[PDB]
Design a protein around this nucleic acid. Structure first.
Ligand SMILES: OC[C@H]1O[C@@](CO)(O[C@H]2O[C@H](CO)[C@@H](O)[C@H](O)[C@H]2O)[C@@H](O)[C@@H]1O
Length: 579
DNA sequence: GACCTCCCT
DNA sequence: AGGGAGGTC
């Protein structure tokens, strides 16, 4: 039962210039959420402070905001954002244990202090789920249980900083933490806090239209089936399709019949019900996920959505986005793409600006494999899919048909994602031997990429892990498995991770550089979103001409590869128009 | 509460 | 390759 002072007021010894700090936000979504307690551990002892007290105290608030007072935390973004909503600035965070753990091994799934501490045989702190409970039983406990927990977390952070930093340094990941991921965390905090404005009237009118179209298609489905049923029930739908209407059963699921879109597409020539079910699903997905889903998370006071970017989740170093997810808003089909009309600038006479890398993953691959043919292709800024068709089919530019380009494109994705005989076959709807011939001809045209693929697999086996341009790592223990499927998946991860991961490194660095350029130029332009290889901003209309030159340049110069990077850009009144 | 089709890069 | 988010048990 760890010693600490349950403090009634803030004292000078709580404001040392080095400390572990816990600002606890228990709600999963930390936007405008309560801070339930504070703990500080420093050279003078261990302290718990009630937030009503600490956050009203001018000395404490100035300490929080002083860059020269260094704090070590876990998930400093959560605290920073929660504090921003209360008008308080958090500065001087020099060590974030969540990001440190994530870099050391993303596969551990570290999401609390206890899981991080377990990596170094430190168990004198409880998992958050043990203290707060799970699901419906989730609750803040009484003060003495709460206080002890926060203090134990702080004490763990204080104890673990040094060994985590030592291991990062041995991995050559110390600059990755200190110069990339930690400064990025501040930039993401500002993006989440600013949020993105939504035209909720426009979404509601879309929702009304969709509701009418759904009622129509739905009636049509019941007419064509000859009865009413729950179209979203796999049991009822599978009975209608595969028993009542006798459609061929092309694929089963562990429980019943598959009605995935790929199966339905193949069944459409047999019965008119099938196109209507597909249409119903496109509409229903829009309605349910995007319209209703966005509307439920829009803040009614500002009409903004404030995503949370999970910076310590993906196995490759990408971000993810949640509540809402703003990295999967429809774009591919026009009907869906119109959802983007509802994402608007947050001030009048401002516009949305979007800049995206062109083929970043293939250009990274060109660089890392040093394939002469691929590098020349990007040096000429060729259409990479047409060029790959020309090579694999041994034809001139004029003889590449649309279908040939389409298939070369699939091969390029396949090569990036780890090249499987069977996997390319499923994808192109072709045979296994056929897919192998495409891959062999690819590797004959790009022998540098073949060498890379062989070499990276051997390197993952030898070292136990693969690395990215900026020294992110991924351990791949399944690469020595004697099970074919398990081993092959590890091999694909070995081939793909340095590509997807290095692309993630580059865009993160560009975000950092951009943020610094925007400040130097004193532009009001603000970063709103990152969607893997693109950045989305809003700015005054009067800044567009300048952003057209600045943004692509910063993004293109973020790193120097053996091939150029290229960035395209667009702007307009809504996110839809920025493209 | 847990398990298990479709949107994005 | 990497993610986030209703029916049935
Ligand atoms: O604060 C984001 C940060 O917290 C973790 C838990 O350590 O994830 C929590 O917050 C996410 C966003 O609200 C939730 O989606 C997630 O379920 C919740 O545990 C980290 O994974 C994340 O980096």
């Amino acid at each position: 039962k760890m010693a600490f002072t349950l403090a009634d007021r803030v004292t000078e010894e709580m404001l040392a210039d080095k400390a572990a700090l816990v600002v606890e936000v228990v709600e999963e979504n930390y936007h405008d959420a309560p801070i339930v307690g504070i703990a500080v551990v420093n050279e003078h002892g261990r302290f718990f402070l009630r937030p009503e007290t600490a956050l009203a105290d001018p000395q404490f608030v100035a300490w929080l905001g002083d860059e020269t007072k260094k704090k070590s935390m876990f998930d400093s973004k959560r605290a920073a954002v929660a504090l921003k909503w209360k008008g308080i600035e958090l500065c001087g965070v020099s060590f974030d244990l969540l990001l440190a753990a994530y870099l050391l091994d993303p596969a551990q799934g570290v999401d609390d202090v206890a899981a991080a501490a377990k990596m170094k045989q430190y168990e004198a702190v409880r998992p958050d789920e043990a203290v707060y409970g799970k699901g419906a039983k989730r609750a803040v406990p009484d003060e003495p249980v709460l206080a002890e927990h926060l203090v134990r977390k702080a004490a763990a952070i204080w104890a673990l900083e040094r060994p985590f930093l030592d291991e990062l340094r041995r991995n050559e990941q110390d600059r990755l933490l200190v110069e990339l991921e930690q400064p990025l965390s501040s930039i993401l905090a500002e993006m989440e806090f600013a949020g993105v404005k939504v035209d909720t009237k426009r979404l509601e009118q879309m929702g009304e239209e969709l509701a009418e179209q759904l009622r129509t298609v739905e009636q049509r489905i019941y007419e064509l089936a000859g009865q009413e049923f729950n179209i979203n029930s796999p049991k009822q739908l599978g009975v209608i399709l595969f028993e009542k209407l006798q459609l061929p059963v092309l694929k089963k699921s562990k429980t019943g019949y598959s009605t995935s879109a790929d199966v339905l597409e193949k069944l459409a020539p047999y019965h008119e019900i099938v196109e209507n079910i597909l249409h119903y699903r496109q509409l229903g997905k829009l309605q349910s996920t995007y319209i209703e889903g966005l509307l439920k998370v829009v803040r009614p006071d500002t009409k903004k959505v404030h995503t949370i970017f999970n910076q310590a989740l993906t196995q490759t170093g990408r971000l993810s986005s949640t509540e809402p997810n703003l990295q999967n808003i429809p774009i591919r089909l026009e009907e869906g793409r119109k959802i983007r009309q509802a994402f608007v600038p947050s001030e009048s006479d401002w516009l949305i600006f979007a800049a995206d890398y062109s083929q970043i993953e293939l250009r990274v691959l060109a660089h890392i494999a040093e394939d002469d043919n691929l590098m020349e292709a990007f040096r000429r800024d060729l259409d990479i899919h047409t060029k790959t068709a020309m090579d694999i089919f041994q034809v001139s530019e004029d003889e590449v048909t649309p279908n040939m380009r389409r298939q070369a494109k699939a091969v390029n994705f396949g090569i990036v994602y780890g090249i499987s005989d069977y996997g390319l076959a499923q994808n192109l709807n072709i045979s296994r031997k056929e897919a192998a011939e495409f891959i062999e001809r690819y590797f004959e045209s790009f022998p540098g990429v073949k060498r890379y693929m062989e070499n990276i697999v051997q390197e993952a086996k030898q070292k136990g892990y693969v690395t990215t341009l900026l020294h992110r790592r991924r351990y791949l223990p399944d690469i020595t498995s004697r099970n074919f499927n398990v081993r092959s998946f590890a091999e694909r991860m070995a081939m793909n991770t340095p590509i997807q991961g290095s692309a993630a490194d580059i865009i993160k660095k560009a975000m950092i550089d951009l943020n610094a350029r925007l400040k130097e130029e004193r532009l009001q332009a603000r970063l709103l979103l990152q969607v893997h290889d693109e950045l989305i901003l809003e700015a005054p209309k009067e800044e567009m001409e300048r952003l057209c030159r600045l943004v692509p340049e910063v993004m293109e110069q973020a790193v120097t590869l053996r091939v150029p990077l290229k960035v395209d850009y667009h702007y307009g009144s809504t996110w839809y128009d920025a493209k």
